């Protein structure tokens, strides 16, 4: 077998996720005699059955493409990235069609202008990987064919998705021949950060939405302009946070400026005074001045041509949402409530918005039914009043966000008709915490859909390459996460039962969980129950299993916005913006899970129109050190980006391809002169058919040999054996001949 003395293996180690070892005696069927670098010697158990991951030869290590490696497993990937990053400082790397970008915190020269002119024209493999190589592969495919192109970027927001997008746009501008997309797009970033980013337990300044920039090209492929869209915004954060989280930065940037005179009308308090900001208990981010960020947000708005009249509108509405949060109900009787007399938060909310106090106080505590002929004003429980108030806050914020994006687009658009576009998606990756909740559940469902699109695109490209090389395409094996997506989204899926439990009377998180267990517990292999609890469930995702706690779900999922409360706000006359938000039914009834599932189907329609290109970003250390690579953090990030699962899917197929001359050169050391022949293709067919016994392992394409995983490492080892033995024989002959001459000299 492949395990021999003088072979190298990876052993699992808790301090650094894998450690290298050498095998001291050849294996024969329950212990291995293992050398190390950490001391010479160690004794290592085999386990009931297992062999360690076997280590690739050092010709393949440090290749520009992880799927050049003959063994594909977590140790090889982690090592190969570490040696490229630490030794050569090559941050970019490839895996299949994906570009992995490892973020140095240090700045680099490599983005500099000349290289733009160097990459342009070059086919994707002909140059070492760099973000420009993907930017060209899009620009070239757009010019070559009708289709728009998309670039898709994933990872924890620290990982540097924005820097990758920024450089992609510089590539487009500089090759295309430009005006003022780049300066404007980078000018928008502080606004979209302030209103769309959030602070999460694992990460400060997380971005809770997917943001899409459509760069527009003329029929001459000159950059016209750009268009922005936003998807998947999580509304629930506005009303509710877990411990040690904040809702969107803008509320804290607004409260931090409460002293300033233009804000004084808002009567803003200390950031933990209000009900929406205080719940996380975490007002100050370490190492940020919020008041300074407010000034940067305003100046970015001014630079995008939102006049100061509207900026004071925006902050007026946000202070409105904060004051609305403090409104507090007393129950009269178990199915009725009212607001107490002259309640100070409601009075300030009515002053800030203009709506007359009696009408808000009336509508917050009642709802209106109407048949066409008759109308009933009906009281509602204190709980329903709270759910309606929070639904009104979420509805205001979601429309304010959509409005600010419509104005940014008004600055970014330009009049010339867009001939085709290239669209660069910054999204979040797969996400798991000690505690997982409706937010994580929606993020993971979005990532399952994106991962499905990626798997189908890779499978299409590989089918086309197999048909190109005259191989049977029926060999290639397709791996389909549709069974999980059907678990989450199909009828009597998790989301559909959550929506049912919202409306069913006396609904609760316990009765929801019980409906899950009845519906799925042993019917679907992907759904599992944690043994020691009844308030949680486990979904086997693409990447990993994830426990989700039930305790949040129904409280967060509910929206219903009572139509009269909007009609009251819409009637207000004091200022332009508040009527302007709500301008254009069934949608008011929809739950947050259903609005999310619709937004994700729009995103998938937008991407399906387009040919993708992928970037992954990984954050190499937890503490922003300039080049330290922490193999624990990088392993976690590589799992969360699905790179390891991509490599698993690839390793099943034929990952490794050789051109007949390049093969023939390397293995001419093995080949015998009788086998050498006037047709190298036939020569290699003969030699290979002898060297590796089972023809199932390899295929002959028209111009390329394909090999299953490991076979190239096997050939490299037999090559090293033959060359070693030949070297030993010549060395012993030369050593003998010289010492024998010294013997003859003593004889003479």
């Amino acid at each position: 077998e492949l395990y021999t003395k003088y072979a190298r293996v990876w052993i699992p180690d808790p301090e650094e996720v894998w450690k290298s070892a050498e095998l001291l005696k050849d294996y024969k069927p329950k212990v291995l005699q293992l050398r190390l670098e950490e001391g010479k010697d160690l004794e290592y158990c085999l386990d009931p059955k297992e062999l360690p991951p076997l280590r690739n030869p050092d010709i393949l290590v440090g290749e520009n493409d992880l799927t050049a490696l003959s063994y594909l497993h977590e140790p090889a990937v982690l090592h190969n990235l570490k040696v490229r990053f630490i030794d050569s400082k090559l941050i970019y790397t490839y895996c299949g069609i994906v570009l992995v970008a490892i973020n140095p915190y240090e700045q680099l020269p490599i983005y500099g202008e000349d290289i733009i002119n160097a990459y342009s024209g070059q086919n994707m493999g002909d140059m070492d990987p760099h973000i420009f190589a993907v930017a060209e592969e899009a620009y070239k495919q757009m010019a070559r064919d009708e289709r728009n192109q998309s670039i898709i970027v994933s990872g924890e927001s620290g990982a540097g998705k924005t820097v990758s997008a920024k450089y992609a746009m510089r590539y487009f501008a500089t090759v295309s021949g430009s005006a003022n997309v780049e300066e404007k797009v980078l000018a928008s970033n502080p606004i979209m950060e302030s209103i769309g980013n959030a602070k999460t337990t694992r990460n400060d300044n997380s971005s809770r939405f997917g943001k899409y920039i459509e760069i527009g090209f003329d029929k001459r492929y000159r950059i016209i302009g750009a268009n922005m869209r936003t998807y998947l915004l999580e509304k629930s954060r506005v009303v509710f946070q877990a411990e040690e989280e904040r809702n969107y930065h803008i509320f804290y940037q607004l409260c931090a400026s409460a002293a300033l005179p233009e804000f004084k009308t808002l009567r803003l308090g200390n950031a933990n005074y209000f009900h929406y900001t205080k719940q996380g208990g975490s007002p100050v981010i370490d190492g940020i001045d919020d008041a300074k960020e407010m000034v940067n947000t305003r100046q970015a708005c001014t630079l995008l041509g939102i006049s100061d009249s509207y900026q004071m509108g925006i902050f007026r509405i946000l202070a409105g949402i904060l004051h609305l949060g403090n409104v507090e109900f007393a129950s009269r009787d178990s199915d009725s409530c009212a607001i107490p007399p002259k309640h100070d938060p409601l009075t300030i909310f009515c002053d800030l918005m203009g709506v007359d106090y009696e009408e808000m106080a009336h509508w917050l505590c009642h709802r209106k039914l109407a048949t066409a002929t008759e109308t009933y004003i009906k009281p509602i429980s204190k709980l329903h009043a709270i759910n309606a108030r929070d639904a009104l806050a979420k509805h205001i914020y979601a429309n304010l966000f959509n409005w600010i994006v419509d104005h940014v687009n008004k600055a970014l658009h330009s009049t010339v008709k867009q001939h085709s576009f290239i669209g660069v998606l910054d999204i979040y990756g797969f996400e798991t915490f000690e505690i997982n909740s409706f937010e994580q559940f929606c993020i993971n469902y979005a990532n399952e859909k994106l991962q499905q699109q990626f798997n189908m695109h890779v499978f299409k490209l590989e089918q086309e390459e197999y048909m190109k090389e005259q191989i049977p395409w029926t060999l290639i094996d397709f791996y389909d996460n549709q069974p999980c997506i059907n678990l989450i989204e199909a009828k009597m899926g998790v989301l559909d039962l959550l929506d049912e439990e919202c409306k069913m009377p006396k609904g609760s998180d316990d009765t929801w969980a019980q409906k899950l267990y009845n519906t799925h517990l042993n019917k679907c292999a992907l759904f599992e129950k944690p043994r020691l609890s009844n308030k949680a469930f486990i979904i086997k995702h693409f990447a990993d299993k994830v426990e989700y706690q039930c305790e949040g779900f129904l409280e967060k999922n509910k929206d219903t916005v009572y139509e009269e409360q909007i009609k009251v706000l819409k009637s207000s006359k004091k200022f332009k913006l508040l009527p302007e938000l709500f301008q254009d039914s069934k949608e008011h009834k929809k739950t947050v899970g259903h609005q999310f599932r619709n937004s994700l189907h729009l995103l998938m329609e937008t991407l399906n129109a387009t040919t993708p290109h992928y970037v992954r970003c990984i954050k190499p250390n937890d503490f922003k050190f300039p080049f330290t690579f922490d193999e624990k953090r990088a392993v976690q990030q590589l799992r969360a980006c699905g790179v390891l699962e991509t490599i698993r899917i690839s390793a099943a197929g034929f990952p490794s391809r050789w051109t007949y001359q390049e093969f023939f050169s390397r293995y001419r050391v093995l080949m015998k002169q009788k086998d050498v022949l006037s047709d190298r293709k036939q020569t290699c067919k003969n030699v290979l058919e002898k060297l590796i016994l089972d023809k199932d392992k390899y295929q002959f394409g028209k111009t390329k040999i394909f090999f299953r995983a490991g076979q190239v490492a096997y050939l490299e080892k037999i090559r090293a054996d033959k060359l070693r033995a030949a070297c030993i024989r010549i060395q012993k002959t030369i050593r003998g001949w010289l010492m024998r001459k010294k013997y003859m000299r003593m004889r003479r």
Binding site: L369, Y376, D496, E500, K503, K506, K589
Partner: protein, 371 residues
Amino acid sequence: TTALVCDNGSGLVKAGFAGDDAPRAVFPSIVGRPRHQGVMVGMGQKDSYVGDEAQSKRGILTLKYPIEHGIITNWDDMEKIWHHTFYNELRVAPEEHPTLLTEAPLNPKANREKMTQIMFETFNVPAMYVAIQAVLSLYASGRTTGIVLDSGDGVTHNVPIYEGYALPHAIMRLDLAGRDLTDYLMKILTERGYSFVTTAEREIVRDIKEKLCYVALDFENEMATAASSSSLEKSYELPDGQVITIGNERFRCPETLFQPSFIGMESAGIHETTYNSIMKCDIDIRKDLYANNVMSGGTTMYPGIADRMQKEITALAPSTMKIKIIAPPERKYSVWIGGSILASLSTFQQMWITKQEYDEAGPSIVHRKCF
């Protein structure tokens, strides 16, 4: 596809799409035929009228009600009323949409058999179900425990429910009604000299009963009050513009619900059948039934019926045990609202009767699946 939700009764038909907040089509459920020789030529004489048309024309017509006491008692007129409901008044073809149908409990089985047979054969509805009115009132009022009292035109029935289980032995049914209150109102109104004989006059009496009756909080005290004083006495305008004045009688009319002995039945009133239904339930649940009494259907709309019920049950029930009456203002429609909620649920989509199951089993399937 949104299921239809249709709620038949004596009196109004209520229909609309599932997931709507309130019913889209509401109209009194009448089939009318002309009873005079048509003299004019080119009049456009029409074989029969349905719903609002029969109300407008009514002076020319005999009005018949095809449902008495929750039983469909001539199937041709009922099939006309469904035809009018789907085609004229909702304007949606039934071959597209599941349908949900509503019935009073403890009805004859043939009423469910025929109602399903007509839905599958004559409208080709792809799937149908039949719910109990009282169960649906609990979905509408937002509960899984309570004793529902639901009284419309036709049937009055109590159904106790406890955490989502019915208690079939405790179901009670009574035939006091908006309708028998109307016939009593005519028979007492005669005592002041006003005689409403024909069916189109009965519709006037029904409108007097809606506008002017109210349930006396204490009966003999208001009888003495009306004897002593005009102050209780109030007046109304018939369609031709004559005025009529009605006195103590206007509270006397809705009281027969509390004392059926007035119309001539012996079975006790809705308070005592509510109490007797609770008493037939086992002793551990009873606190929660007293905590929730849910009223439903139009005959519980009278001003003061909620307070008269709370007082009169409290007098019957043990003194410590808190009695509460839950009378939501919408309660005339709550059987439809409950049907809307139920038809919208995802779990229910399993539970429709489907056309294949009907073709396999024949129309008896309804008894097995529905209740």
